[PDB]
Amino acid sequence: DIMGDKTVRVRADLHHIIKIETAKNGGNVKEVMDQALEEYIRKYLPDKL
């Protein structure tokens, strides 16, 4: 069940957009990025699962 994280870089303008949204009420940049990756993988690399 354990899993660590990795530091990566992303365009500042994209980061700013998520930062602003998660700052409103509920949300976390890390969670958004993970979800964004999961959707990318499901879309372009479906041969995963």
Added chain:
Amino acid sequence: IMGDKTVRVRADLHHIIKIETAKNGGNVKEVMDQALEEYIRKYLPDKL
């Protein structure tokens, strides 16, 4: 001209992208950016 910011992502998802990108030859950052931009245009239209 556009700078970058750091973010923490799940290690398993990163590994999957790293393996896949290594095949073709590109870099992980381009994938992170595409993944995030697509998420934004989908759930946060008009922000870009």
